[PDB]
């Protein structure tokens with residue numbers, strides 16, 4: 001359970017913890033995650049790669065899908081441009097400390113046997129359910145394309161084709177994963193990570209919303225981005241600064257300050273920080289300052305490698 | 307970070323800025339005094355862990371084994387106390403501490419040492435000496451000799467850092483007043499005994515010894531003071547705070563929410579204060595974690 005603790009920690013749900021126990025009893029086990037290549041890799045990506053590294057340390061072989069064909073179907077551009085971004089993304093994930101098997105979706109998702117099962121699955125997936133599964137994933141389209149409903153079926157089939165025991169993704173993948181659990185002969189365990197709040201507090205962090213910290217942002221950019229961030233005094237949920245403190249910072253954490261309010265604060269844990277903030281013993285401005293400097297240092301090794 | 311490793315789980319540092327200055331030097335030392343004890347318990351272990359923190363931050367560690375004080379306080383003959391102290395040395399080594407050891411009797415009766423005690427006695431008012439002892443103490447002459455003896459011992463050691471309990475606070479402040487070299491003082495908390503009636507001591511069933519068997523640990527924790535919802539003065543919660551590693555998992559039935567993974571002591575504290583974690587499940591968890599923490603020590607002894 002030191003391993004299992006490593007896995008469950010900071011996830012939103014595991015479907016199911018029962019089945020996940022049975023998986024852990026094996027000398028060979030594999031876990032996969034896919035990412036549409038993105039020109040900006042931000043903290044939401046980093047959270048998920050941290051979880052893949054967790055799974056690695058519990059004895060899992062890790063597969064990262066650079067999902068060039070998914071990004072193509074989801075209107076991100078032409079394959080050759082997308083693949084270039086994918087190669088950059090691979091370098092960022094490696095810089096994050098993940099040594100894994102990096103594979104382009106198009107290396108397997110065009111195989112005759114893959115496609116034939118996409119077509120089998122299409123006969124069993126309603127249009128309603130396919131479109132519903134994409135509400136949090138599909139690029140906004142006034143006039144939605146056929147591509148949008150092929151995408152979730154292709155994703156269902158990826159775990160079947162590769163024979164992985166565990167699929168990891170953000171909570172926005174939840175509906176595809178439930179479809180996958182109903183349709184495939186072997187259940188695969190699904191681990192869902194939280195979705196970070198955008199820096200302005202409006203909805204989720206996204207490469208296309210301009211409301212994110214990128215792992216390669218400069219110190220000066222990170223300070224500017226945190227200083228303008230939404231950070232309501234004493235409110236924790238939907239507060240992206242507190243989310244950063246929860247999911248990325250290392251404790252103990254020293255928050256310097258003059259003796260005239262409370263003096264220097266050595267914070268033992270995120271929970272201590274949460275108490276201090278909810279009781280308004282720590283002001284948003286001082287929280288932001290400390291979080292900016294700590295995140296700059298956490299991200300420095302990734303920056304240095306790119 | 308080195309400062310944070312030294313501060314964690316201390317009661318006070320006199321002073322933090324001075325500590326940060328010491329941390330810049332490439333050669334630095336810290337001392338602590340222990341009266342030799344036939345059983346080494348978690349109260350001792352708390353203080354040795356703090357010397358290990360210092361050792362890991364580059365300090366050379368000196369342990370003063372206080373055999374003269376023990377001899378004067380009626381704990382036996384000096385040769386008998388030496389045998390206990392030599393055992394304590396093996397326990398501290400098993401705990402991970404690499405230190406130099408000195409017995410009080412090896413320096414504190416030397417002629418030039420004694421003359422300096424008397425020099426300090428001539429300089430030091432009874433009023434100031436009594437004030438330094440107000441907390442530790444028909445008062446005896448011994449009461450005012452103790453503080454000037456402690457000051458002289460700090461002068462004789464010449465360490466950068468002194469470590470002890472808040473009980474020693476006023477002695478440490480007198481050392482800082484009277485001596486040219488300003489020693490940095492680190493004060494550690496004390497542990498409640500398993501009975502909840504005072505500080506951990508060698509009273510029957512009132513301590514966990516670091517070499518207690520797993521069954522002895524389970525039996526003592528089972529009958530310890532641990533009232534529902536109470537964190538203050540709760541020795542089981544203090545053990546979770548000062549010795550356990552986080553995160554940790556508490557098995558709990560699904561109708562309560564299922565197994566608990568607690569990220570930190572503070573998360574444990576809120577849960578227990580709220581009666582969201584029952585004393586018997588806290589006790590069972592703390593006992594099993596503590597057994598695992600102590601096992602490498604037990605096996606080296």
Ligand SMILES: N[C@@H](Cc1ccc(O)c(OCc2ccccc2[N+](=O)[O-])c1)C(=O)O
Pocket residue numbers: 033034035036065066067068069070071073104105106109137150151152153154155156158159173
């Ligand atoms: N939906 C994910 C992307 C993702 C997740 C899991 C996968 O197995 C995955 O790749 C397979 C795939 C799924 C859907 C369409 C195309 C492909 N493809 O690249 O061949 C992509 C995202 O939102 O970035």
Ligand SMILES: [Ca+2]
Pocket residue numbers: 517518519522
């Ligand atoms: Ca025994």
Ligand SMILES: [Cl-]
Pocket residue numbers: 371372373374375376409410411414
């Ligand atoms: Cl002594």
